[PDB]
């Protein structure tokens, strides 16, 4: 009955819309909750991604201050400039004049012990004094991976709270209006037949929530742009937090839809197993 297979989906959807359009205040009140819940995790992903764009402040400092010989020689420093480019754990040793020294920023942070590379660097044409402070490396390495534990914890906690709220709400909603699940079953019908409409309105709730979060997050970031552009121009730069990419937003919404769908399976399964003839 493939033709009827198509008809089941068609009638199921239009009925849900009438059910959804009916009782609008309650449906909106529900949809808003998991929309705003869904906003938080992906919003934090966007925030961390945006700060990843400004990925030069991590290294920033901690340049090996290899003092060039007190006697002025720009040519010798320019000659040794390119060798540092070859080696890893560095970027480029830019030659500086007396008004001499040459410096290079690292890529990672490492820790105490990687200054053996600095002592090895203090064997070059221009070596007056190798200068690479340690304690800064210590403090920076303490700050990082501490940030990593911190972000790890926030991420996992927030993912769990989102999953719990969406699952519980879908479960309770399915528990209400129970009479259908049996009144259709005893007279006949299959598992998929009774299951379909419940999949449908859950999918609609997920879609609506996914849409609402988009607008909320975009408005919030636009609100916060005021200070970020100020400080960006203020520091002598141009880095303002940007808007929502559509490619990411569609992935945001589809996740909500599939989440509602799987929640529909989970909620319906309990009742279906409960009302077994046993």
């Amino acid at each position: 009955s493939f033709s009827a297979y198509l008809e089941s989906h068609r009638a199921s959807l239009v009925d849900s819309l009438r059910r959804l359009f009916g009782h609008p205040f309650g449906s909106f009140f529900t949809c808003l909750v998991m929309g705003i819940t869904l906003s938080l995790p992906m919003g934090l992903s966007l925030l961390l991604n945006n700060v990843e764009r400004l990925g030069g402040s991590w290294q920033r400092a901690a340049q090996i201050s290899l003092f060039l010989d007190l006697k002025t020689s720009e040519n010798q420093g320019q000659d040794l400039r390119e060798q540092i480019e070859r080696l890893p754990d560095v970027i480029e040793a830019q030659l500086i004049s007396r008004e001499p020294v040459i410096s290079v920023t690292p890529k990672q942070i490492d820790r105490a012990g990687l200054e053996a590379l600095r002592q090895q660097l203090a064997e070059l044409p221009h070596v007056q004094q190798a200068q690479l402070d340690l304690v800064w490396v210590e403090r920076l390495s303490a700050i990082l991976k501490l940030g990593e534990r911190f972000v790890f914890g926030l991420t996992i906690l927030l993912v769990l709270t989102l999953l719990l709220v969406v699952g519980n709400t879908i479960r309770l909603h399915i528990e209400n209006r129970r009479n259908e699940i049996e009144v259709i079953k005893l007279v006949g019908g299959t598992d998929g037949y009774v299951r379909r409409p419940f999949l449908y309105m859950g999918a609609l709730y997920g879609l609506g929530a996914g849409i609402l979060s988009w607008a909320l997050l975009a408005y919030s970031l636009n609100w916060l742009n005021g200070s970020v552009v100020n400080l960006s121009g203020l520091y002598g730069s141009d880095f303002g937090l940007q808007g929502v990419p559509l490619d990411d937003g569609l992935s945001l919404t589809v996740g909500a839809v599939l989440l509602g769908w799987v929640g529909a399976w989970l909620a319906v399964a309990r009742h279906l197993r409960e009302l077994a003839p046993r």
Binding site: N179, E180, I184, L186, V187, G188, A276, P277
Partner: protein, 222 residues
């Protein structure tokens, strides 16, 4: 082919809903059941409905026994029989038309002849003016006869039903069991049960009477 044998259901709670039953029923026959208040009749036919298990004995329906049946096979047998209940069950917020039409979509047929058939079912119950209304709107007997029509449609190969016209006009029940007999005119077996002994003395009858789980308070008496 509806034979019973040494069946009886005792609840885990302790009550014995059914003591002991054994008999047979032939195809296309009218049946009637009576008894006191505590007699197990709704339970008795629920055994055929099989939302529970026999708890004792065995019952055979055609090739396969009702006990020890795959749940996957359950719709394939529950979609062949129309029923009605003392506490009638109807889909609120869905009007009368689709409420009746449910089995048609369950099997699956085009909508035009489906509306044709529901219209045809409407006159045999005399509810022409109630064609689009919520079940909550209807008067007490109206939804009872609505459920009756729900069982009537799709010409079920067999009918079970419960006490009909339990709240209906005595005159109005006349044409009702007349329609029941009209259904019985074809290869349709009816297992109606009731308490109104007055009208169960007219046509062919069987008067299977239950008393406190005892199968034989009466006999054929045909």
């Amino acid at each position: 082919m509806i034979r019973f044998e040494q069946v009886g259901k005792r609840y885990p709670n302790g009550h014995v809903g059914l003591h002991e039953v054994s008999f047979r029923v032939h195809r296309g026959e009218i049946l009637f059941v009576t008894g006191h208040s505590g007699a197990g009749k709704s339970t008795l036919l629920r055994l055929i409905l099989a939302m529970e298990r026999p708890t004792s004995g065995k019952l055979l329906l055609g090739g396969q026994d009702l006990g020890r049946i795959t749940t996957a096979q359950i719709p394939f047998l529950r979609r062949q029989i129309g029923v009605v209940f003392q506490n009638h069950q109807l889909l609120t917020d869905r009007t009368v038309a689709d409420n009746i039409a449910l089995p048609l979509q369950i099997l699956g047929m085009p909508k035009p002849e489906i509306a044709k058939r529901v219209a045809s079912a409407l006159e045999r119950v005399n509810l022409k003016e109630k064609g689009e209304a919520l079940p909550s709107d209807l008067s007490t007997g109206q939804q009872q006869r609505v459920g009756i029509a729900r069982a009537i449609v799709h010409q079920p190969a067999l009918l079970l039903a419960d006490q009909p016209t339990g709240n209906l006009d005595p005159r109005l029940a006349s044409e009702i069991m007349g329609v029941f007999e009209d259904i019985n005119r074809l290869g349709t077996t009816v297992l109606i049960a009731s308490h109104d002994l007055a009208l169960i003395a007219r046509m062919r009858h069987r008067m299977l009477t239950l008393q406190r789980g005892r199968i034989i308070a009466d006999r054929e008496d045909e």
